């Protein structure tokens, strides 16, 4: 097929700085950090990801994906740097995890924000499609908030051309991955958003799963949705990957939705609740020369 012509950018020490700990698990640690290319007068806002031959064959086979990418709703990789650790510069999503997002501002998020991150989730998902790229790990943990306004999807660590409770059931039974499978995963997704974050089956063990699922049981209907709403996350969890809807008719189904919220989703005080947008006061160290990665082409 198709030559994968993504440059791969290699970026110096020196360019950059790591300012304080954003996250650290067992893959090592993120950073947030300032990003001062060559002679440009630029400070761009980035996120760090520092790491054995083996994990940074892992970590290189996550840099290939998101170089790969090009899209407003999927997360690209600025560039490398190769220390002694090698890491990985992102962009700065200075909001976190789109899951922590609705847990803490649950009393501020109303129905347009819920319907508008769906609509950017499918147009994210839909682009990787294009690009012939199985995600294999969509949740609402691997969608980041740059603005509360704007979404993107992340976390390519298991992305081809294990987390039971997302995935399709062919996935748990015979580790058959589609894009069909991904939109079981956006059904998730969505659960998880429409439940302001709770754990999808929560107190179920993930080897009771795979019976619970062929049984016909399903997430339940979250409290704010309507029968229109809740429709849409079931078909995303048919048994027949097929039967289950397209993310381009996602896009299509959500948006139309988007224009009318409060006929699909039901939210006490809904109109009356406002998050941080960038026409607010200190929504924004030396605040000169300052770009955001999406503004700084080469
Ligand atoms: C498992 O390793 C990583 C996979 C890639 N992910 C990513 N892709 C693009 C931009 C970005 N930037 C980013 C991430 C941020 C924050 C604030 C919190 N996080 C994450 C990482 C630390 C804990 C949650 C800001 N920007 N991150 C973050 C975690």
């Known amino acids: 097929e198709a030559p994968n012509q993504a440059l791969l950018r290699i970026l110096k020490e020196t360019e950059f700085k790591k300012i304080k700990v954003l996250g650290s698990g067992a893959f090592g640690t993120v950073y947030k950090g300032l990003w001062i290319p060559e002679g440009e007068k630029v400070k761009i806002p980035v996120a760090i990801k520092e790491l054995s031959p083996k994990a940074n064959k892992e970590i290189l086979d996550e840099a290939y994906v998101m170089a790969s990418v090009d899209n407003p709703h999927v997360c690209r990789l600025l560039g490398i740097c190769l220390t002694s650790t090698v890491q990985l510069i992102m962009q700065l999503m200075p909001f976190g995890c789109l899951l922590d997002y609705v847990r803490e501002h649950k009393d501020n998020i109303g129905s347009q924000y819920l319907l508008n991150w769906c609509v950017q989730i499918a147009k994210g998902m839909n682009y990787?499609?294009?690009?012939?790229?199985?995600?294999?790990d969509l949740a609402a943990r691997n969608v980041l908030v740059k603005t509360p306004q704007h979404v993107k999807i992340t976390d390519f660590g298991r992305a081809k051309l294990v987390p039971i409770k997302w995935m399709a059931?062919?996935?748990?039974?015979?580790?058959?991955?589609?894009?069909?499978?991904?939109?079981?995963?956006?059904?998730?997704?969505?659960?998880?958003?429409?439940?302001?974050?709770?754990?999808?089956?929560?107190?179920?063990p993930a080897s009771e799963i795979?019976?619970?699922?062929?049984?016909?049981?399903?997430?339940?209907?979250?409290?704010?949705?309507?029968?229109?709403?809740?429709?849409?996350?079931?078909?995303?969890?048919?048994?027949?990957?097929?039967?289950?809807?397209?993310?381009?008719e996602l896009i299509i189904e959500f948006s139309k939705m988007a224009r009318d919220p409060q006929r699909y989703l039901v939210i006490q005080g809904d109109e009356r609740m406002h998050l941080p947008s960038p026409t607010?006061?200190?929504?924004?160290?030396?605040?000169?020369?300052?770009?955001?990665?999406?503004?700084?082409?080469?």
């Open 128 to 136: 990787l499609e294009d690009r012939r790229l199985v995600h294999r």
């Open 210 to 248: 795979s019976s619970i699922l062929e049984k016909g049981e399903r997430l339940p209907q979250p409290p704010i949705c309507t029968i229109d709403v809740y429709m849409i996350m079931v078909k995303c969890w048919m048994i027949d990957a097929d039967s289950r809807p397209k993310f381009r």
């Open 169 to 204: 059931l062919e996935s748990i039974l015979h580790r058959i991955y589609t894009h069909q499978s991904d939109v079981w995963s956006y059904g998730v997704t969505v659960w998880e958003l429409m439940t302001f974050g709770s754990k999808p089956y929560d107190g179920i």
């Open 280 to 298: 607010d006061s200190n929504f924004y160290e030396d605040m000169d020369d300052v770009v955001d990665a999406d503004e700084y082409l080469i």
